Amino acid sequence: HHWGYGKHNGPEHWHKDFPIAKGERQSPVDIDTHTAKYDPSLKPLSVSYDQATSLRILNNGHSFQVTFDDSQDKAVLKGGPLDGTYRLLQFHFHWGSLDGQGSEHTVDKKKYAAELHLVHWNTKYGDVGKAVQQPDGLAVLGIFLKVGSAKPGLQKVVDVLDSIKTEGKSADFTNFDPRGLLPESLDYWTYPGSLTTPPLAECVTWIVLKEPISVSSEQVLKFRKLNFNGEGEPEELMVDNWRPAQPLKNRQIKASFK
Ligand SMILES: [N]S(=O)(=O)[C][C][C][C][C][C]C123[B@]45[B@@]67[B@@]89[C@]1%10B81%11B698B746B814B562B%10%1143
Ligand SMILES: [Zn+2]
């Protein structure tokens, strides 16, 4: 049992191969908006994506991901709760079988239809493998998706998903601008946590934006046509690829806004 999201290999099984699943700083979590403290010392987040170079889009058996050139400081996250500079490696999504679930973080127990993660790693550690071994190695920018109006900036992604239906498939995905996926406000919540997929490493500063983006029903329906399986294996829709909320334990969620 390679891990997944089903009855026999899903999140409640992960601790057997990855014991840190039951650790002290696991993600995602419920963001209780009334308990999160406004921290007037938190800086605005700096998102510098003007020089981003997308490379490929890939179905990895658990999500689909757009990968970027992280060999230079072209698309970087700085400021906010972070020290130093974090390079964009990839983005991917988590989504549901229906619109009432799909997000990993929840807000006062509310689930969104999907959640976008933009994954960045701290350049002081030189590469992402080294960064995942450090408590401040990664910064993941989390954006909620609700269903309503279409997101134009998402359409270029949606339109190539038919070409990466099954696990292992990839395609050229150049000149994609991730600025088109961002909401107006960069107000955020932040807390120390983990990767939400194996190996569940406790290396992430989470930055979760308050404002969701709206996507259309037709856009999310295309997510739901992807397959967890490889080509030629029984077809199993890539849906509900989200880890549930984990215990907060001894952590404080801080808000950038009043
Ligand atoms: N859902 S989420 O946003 O929390 C997920 C972020 C996963 C980022 C990739 C980290 C990795 B995985 B293990 B070690 C590092 B080296 B090897 B494989 B390579 B990938 B890279
Ligand atoms: Zn993720």
Beta bridge partners of 197: none
d(CA 103, CA 7): 19
Distance 243 CA to ligand 2 centre (A): 9
Distance 123 CA to ligand 2 centre (A): 20
How is residue 11 written in tokens?
Answer: 């999140």
Nearest atom in ligand 1 to 27's CA? 4
Domain-wise residue ranges, the chain: 1-258
Distance 165 CA to ligand 2 centre (A): 19
d(CA 31, CA 21): 19
d(CA 144, CA 215): 10
Asked whether 80 and 46 are in contact (CB, 8 A), the reply is yes
- From 95, 118, 120, 132, the mutation candidate for ligand 1 (largest count of ligand atoms within 8 A of CB) is 132
117 carries a ligand binding annotation:
yes
Contacts with 16 (C-beta within 8 Å, 6 or more apart), sequence order: none
Annotated catalytic residue 2: no
- From 27, 128, 134, the mutation candidate for ligand 1 (largest count of ligand atoms within 8 A of CB) is 128
Give, using CA atoms, the residue closest to atom 11 of ligand 1: 129
Rounded to 5 degrees, φ, ψ at 94 are -125, 140
Residue whose tokens read 């046509």: 225
The ligand 1 site (C-beta within 6 Å) comprises 117, 119, 128-129, 132, 140, 195-197, 199
Picking from 174, 78, 65, the residue whose alpha carbon sits closest to that of residue 123 is: 78
Residues with CB under 5 A from ligand 2 (ion): 117
How is residue 62 written in tokens?
Answer: 């658990």
Choose, from 1, 62, 105, 120, the residue flagged as catalytic: 62
d(CA 195, CA 214): 25
Distance 93 CA to ligand 1 centre (A): 13
User: Given in angstroms, what resolution was this structure solved at?
Assistant: 1.4
DSSP string covering the chain:
----SSTTTSGGGGGGT-GGGGSSS-S--EE-TTTSEE-TTPPPEEEE-TT--EEEEEE-SS-EEEEE--SSSSSEEEETT--S-EEEEEEEEEE-SSTT---SSEETTBPPSEEEEEEEEEGGGSSHHHHTTSTTSEEEEEEEEEESS--GGGHHHHTTGGGG-STT-EEE--S--GGGG--S---EEEEEE--SSTT--S-EEEEEESSPEEE-HHHHHHHTT-BSSPTTSPP-B-----PPP----S---EES--
How is residue 7 written in tokens?
Answer: 């009855």
Picking from 138, 148, 135, 258, the residue whose alpha carbon sits closest to that of residue 207 is: 138
Nearest atom in ligand 1 to 194's CA? 4
CB atoms within 10 A of CB 13: 16
